[model samples]
Target: GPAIGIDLGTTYSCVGVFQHGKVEIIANDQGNRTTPSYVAFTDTERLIGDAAKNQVAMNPTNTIFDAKRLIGRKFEDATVQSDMKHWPFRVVSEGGKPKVQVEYKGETKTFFPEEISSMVLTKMKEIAEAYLGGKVHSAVITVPAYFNDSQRQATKDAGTITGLNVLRIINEPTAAAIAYGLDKKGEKNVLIFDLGGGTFDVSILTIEDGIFEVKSTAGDTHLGGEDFDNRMVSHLAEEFKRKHKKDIGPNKRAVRRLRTACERAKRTLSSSTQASIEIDSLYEGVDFYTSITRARFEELNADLFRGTLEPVEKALRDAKLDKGQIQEIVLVGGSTRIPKIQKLLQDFFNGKELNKSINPDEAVAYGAAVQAAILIG
Candidate 1:
């Protein structure tokens, strides 16, 4: 059986297989290389990926997203408290660790983060198996560089629950470096800036003669594009309340619709000068409509964008290297596609063009596939 690579991300996930001396990304039934990391529980069935994401507006409480952030965390942790406010699903303590509770098949059940994550892994495995025309038993999974031991273990446990032999738990930056450096030779200093949907990581690495070594790493696990979405959600929610004279703040369905709109607007403003948010019957039969200019989006998220730079500088400082020493700047993750994020890094590096040869959304999974090949051979 062939080994596969899985990038089990916070907001999206991807799976790849190594074959014919190349990495081939396996798309789901929907023909999408990337799958949204969302799961929905309903009375008759459990949905994953796009199907689950589509139900967020009407079934916010039963739709679980951002499970990556809460995985391997204690309920008493301050971070969990802060994160709880952002999620509409129920999070409760069971034996001191946080657990997600949702109604499934008309029964209220509690689930561990690992179990939820396994559902995602299971979906990936099914896709890979279907592509390979056989069962796959081994895989290499990638996680954020700053993930602690417990978090790493939880990810491995997820693979175990999915019946995969987790061959390696590799750092996401290192995996990205493999994908970038596999075809190149000689020495190079590379910096990887990874801003995903729910986490931020910056890594400074030295690659020489096919060896990729991490010099330093820094990041905030709770920060990323989702934070930007939240800012937009807040702005829209306040605007709705002010205009309609009613608070939609506590309505999960309304908030979910607003969040979905915010996410759409954020992605649109990434390239366009402006994006409009228009939702019919947003709350109490009142339509919600607003337009956000890219400038306004940047103004609202300036601090968030700036916050990512702190880790970049800190990584360089710890690595004892100046910005000029970085021979290559690799951008990984969907969030890096944002114009402001690109501009920020460009400005920081004195107008250096970022290495965008690989697809930002699929690079990590590709790297993991390469690693899987190396490990299995």
Candidate 2:
């Protein structure tokens, strides 16, 4: 009897419902509001979310992550080509389209991105059902504003395969704008700078009388916090190779450990000046220890940081608006928590303070819930 909103994110996913005049985020079985968009398969069990993420280090080949990046794309697509080298899991072509291949229970299986994403959607559906105490048949899903027709349809297909009636496929920035504007009654132009784990989107929108309309959108699907993590991972890998004469990049388990360490360090550097990455037995029973200063991290990712700004400028230009015309700038997506991104955006907007009224990670789902409520009611 209840419809929900789903943010089927590249790195993390969340589900929310509008009930009793309020939006409630449904937590996974782990009691967390957000679930990592990961899936792992073992001898006899299929795992999702936290469970799957936990197995990445031990079974990287069977753990599928970042499938969103490959969804609805052909194997020859530039993004897919670039991703093949970075992912530990196998990716193969299925009728010219990219598909994930994994070994499970001594059998090699191939899966479409939509199927893997459906597993994630199915998990979200279970969470919603458990939280609402009933089966939810409908959902409004959010995707990047810059997603093409195929990508949007692929997202809908994922929901359909999960047995959800996909009511709408909304752009993520528009959903965020709704979440930010729902409580405020005003006419204003807002710029949403969304830097998620695996994609970046900048949308200029006009909000008026509870109506959120997108003026222009621009982004790089391959660019996001994960890219930032990869930069640190690469730096560390090269450093390790120099000192130990062993390259851990090719080792799935070692790379998983390194990736986990880099992600932790990245989050730490967001709030602190320096963070240390120390992993025991990372490769060949040797330990890897290193400290990275925020300054150095920023320097290493200077080009990546600058890369996000181009889309911001493009969105503004496409919207026929200048920085001063944007009444407010809203930071969306988990990656916005990076100090460098915050500072750069602030300075770029002529020192204008950003709106942090909505939780960066939860806003899209909240807004999707609002949309679902409107559609269902």
Candidate 3:
């Protein structure tokens, strides 16, 4: 049997297999590199990942994403209160816990985030089992570095629900640093700046003689690429409301379209300096369009950029190191691909180069797989 590594994230999940000193990411039948960490249920069956995420816009009441945030949180948490006010889906307070409920085919079904995540976990386990041509029993999983004890326990619970013995819960930034440390040997102190789909973490570590020790880490439990997408989408939606003289903020369909446009534009801006934003039927029959310049994006993200820097500074403080003492900084997670993020880091550390060698999106799983390989030995 082969060992597995799971990066169970807020927006996406990835599983990797280790064999013969190599790591391979398990590509889904759709040939996609990552799976959406969303789930929807019908009366008789459960839908996992991409297929379930696709149904959210059309069936808002049935599909759930971002459950990672709700894991281990109280029903009365300020965050939950805020989400309850705007989230289109039905959330019920049962046993003092906020559980998602969906009415499908006249039947009402309720589930916790752990239950929804378990479905995805099961899918990934099956992939590993099939690839190894046998049962895959144990694995290493990664989570946001700043996740609280409750959140971490909830993630471990998700693994248990899937019937896998989770050996360890590695932090995303630490994992990335490990991958970088192994591939590039050094005796230098480095920083890992990780921005994933739903969370961000900055960790300082010293690697020596194949031992990686974390000095300090800091992050926002709710900051990541997802926020950027929402920021852009909100602006675009406002523009649509202006052009059509009609508000579609409450329309589920309109929100979905604008959300898709925001994500596409976010990716486009990564490579192109500017991208055209266009939308049709934003309010069920009106056409709206606009152009988003990279400059405009930076302006919109001004506070967001500042927000990220504060965490980095905190990490340095916690690690008791000055900016000048850092040897190198590595960017891990998909959002770091944004030009604005790269430029911001460049300016903050006074012209230090951000490591772009490893795929920010895959670094966590790759690192987890490396750990699995060692344990397998």
Please report, in order, the local distance difference test score of every candidate based on alpha carbons.
0.88, 0.87, 0.80
Root-mean-square deviation of candidate 3? 3.1
- What is the C-alpha local distance difference test score of candidate 1? 0.88
Clashes of 2: 0
Q: Whose TM-score is greatest here?
A: 3
> Which scores greater on lDDT, model 1 or model 2?
1
For 1-377, candidate 3 gives per-residue lDDT tens digits of 46788888777888888777777888876776688888877666678887887776666767788787788788888988887775677787888887889875578888887887788889788767766777888888887666788888888898899898888888776677766654367466788888887778788887777666778888886788878888887887777767667887888778878888888888899899888768876676777677898877777788886788898999999988998888879888888998878988989989987788777887888788777777767
Q: In angstroms, how far off is 373's CA in candidate 2?
A: 1.8
Error of 3 at 218 (Å): 2.3
CA error at residue 66 for candidate 3, angstroms = 2.9
TM-score each candidate. 0.85, 0.85, 0.86
Stretches > 4 Å off in candidate 2: 73-86, 90-98, 182-184, 234-255, 274-293
lDDT of 2 by residue, 1-377 (tens): 49599999887999999889888888888898999899998998899998998777788889998888888788999879998998989999989988899988889999999999999999999989988887889999998777799998988999999999999999888888777653375468889898888778888888777667889988887778889999988988999999999998778678868988999999899789999888998888899988989998899899998778899999999999988899878888888888888988899988999877676889899999998998988
Stretches of model 1 off by over 4 angstroms after superposition:
70-86, 92-97, 233-255, 276-278, 283-291
